[PDB]
Amino acid sequence: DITMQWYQQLQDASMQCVLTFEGLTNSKDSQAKKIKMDLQKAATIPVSQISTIAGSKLKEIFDKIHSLLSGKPVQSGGRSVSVTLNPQGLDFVQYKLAEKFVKQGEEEVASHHEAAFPIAVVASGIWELHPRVGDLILAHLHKKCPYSVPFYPTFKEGMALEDYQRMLGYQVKDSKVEQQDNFLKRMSGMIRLYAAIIQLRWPYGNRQEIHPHGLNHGWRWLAQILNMEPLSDVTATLLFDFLEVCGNALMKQYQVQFWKMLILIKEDYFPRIEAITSSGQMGSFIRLKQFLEKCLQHKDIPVPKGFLTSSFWRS
Amino acid sequence: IIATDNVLFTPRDKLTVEELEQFQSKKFTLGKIPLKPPPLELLNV
Ligand SMILES: [Cl-]
């Protein structure tokens, strides 16, 4: 109840953003469309280039976003863009930026798990400098992936099925819904990105304050899905690829309390999944078990493959 | 900006006795893991 209220706040607060720049997207002029596209363009290219191999280029993208969003001008395709005296453009760019951060976790991190970390540090620093952009990141992240709240959408009477399949996060064309394999991968990448945000912090800038969306939200998420009955394939999947990404940082921060949480899913929550899942869809639960058996006897959770190293920050 | 709570370790005080006794046990209880993060005193158990 406490979480669903907070969920609605960010949701209704994102809806207020959809209306605050009303008329900037609803226009038929040639210039009204030229501004909208040029801002939508100069606010998503930097995030698309985050697939990087050196911190030196990753900082170029960070500043390019910070300049564009703070009021300063930025280079786009052909001509330079600005936002001053574009009160709709400022609130409009925070929306398109926040969604592009999630879209990359949806169509890049799903295919390639390593890309979560360079996207997380950049999303974490902008969230730190602009907490409004971060609340918009949680808004889209939450709706596109309600399992990240976490909350399992419920079977609804009185609403159409397509509207309900939309609730579950399934991608739907006008005719039909996407498959499950393409949907489970999209959901994974979205929480691997989120599991990366709550542990990484943008190094440069000298920030006095706390992490914007701290690693505490990682503890509750695990607590909040393990105190509720698991879904057949989703839970065992999302649970694994969350611990692999944030299990190390959670072990260090919560030393024994995390191990207690790990000797519980092995002893209590694993039997919970055996009854609910048919033999046809055990592929997720088996990889959830292989992942622990190592960690439990090794007394350590491996660092996520793709974590940023010192060599990266010098490159 | 919307209200969001960001505490890494919840203080031992202000915490419910339910959640306190879960953290102090050698094993958790299924379905009652505390939502708030553990406190600073019990990270060495
Ligand atoms: Cl909360």
Numbering used by the authors:
A (entry chain B): 384 to 698
B (entry chain C): 379 to 423
Sentences from the paper on this structure:
At the cytoplasmic face of the NPC, Nxf1•Nxt1-bound mRNPs encounter the cytoplasmic filament nucleoporins Gle1, Nup42, and Nup214, which specifically activate the DEAD-box helicase DDX19 to remove Nxf1•Nxt1 from the mRNP8. DDX19 is a member of the DEAD-box helicase family, which are RNA-dependent ATPases composed of two RecA domains (referred to as DDX19NTD and DDX19CTD throughout the text). Gle1CTD plays an important organizational role by providing spatially separated binding sites for Nup42GBM and the DEAD-box helicase DDX19/scDbp5. A comprehensive structure-function analysis of DDX19 indicates that binding of Gle1CTD•Nup42GBM induces a conformational change in DDX19, thereby stimulating its ATPase activity.
The difficulty of purifying human Gle1CTD has previously prevented a detailed biochemical analysis of the human proteins, but the dramatic effect of yeast Nup42GBM on Gle1CTD stability led us to test whether human Nup42GBM has the same effect on human Gle1CTD. Co-purification of a homologous human Gle1CTD•Nup42GBM complex (containing Gle1 residues 382−698 and Nup42 residues 379−423) resulted in dramatic improvements in the stability of Gle1CTD and the yields increased from ~0.5 to ~50 mg/100 l of bacterial culture. In thermostability experiments, the Tm of human Gle1CTD increased from 37 to 50 °C in the presence of Nup42GBM. To evaluate whether the mode of interaction observed for S. cerevisiae Gle1CTD•Nup42GBM was conserved in other eukaryotes, we determined the crystal structures of human Gle1CTD•Nup42GBM at 2.8 Å resolution and of C. thermophilum Gle1CTD•Nup42GBM in the presence and absence of IP6 at 2.17 and 2.65 Å resolution, respectively. The overall structure of Gle1CTD is conserved between fungi and humans, with minor differences resulting from small insertions or different loop sizes. Both human and C. thermophilum Nup42GBM adopt the same fold as S. cerevisiae Nup42GBM and recognize the same surface on Gle1CTD, with the critical hydrophobic residues nearly universally conserved. However, no binding of IP6 to human Gle1CTD•Nup42GBM was detected up to concentrations of 200 μM. All three LCCS1/LAAHD mutations possessed altered thermostability that correlated with their phenotypic disease manifestation, with the R569H variant exhibiting the largest difference in Tm, from 50 °C for wild-type protein to 40 °C for the disease variant. In our crystal structures, R569 is involved in an extensive network of intra-molecular interactions, whereas V617 and I684 are both buried in hydrophobic cores, supporting the conclusion that these mutations reduce the stability of Gle1 rather than affecting their ability to stimulate the activity of DDX19.
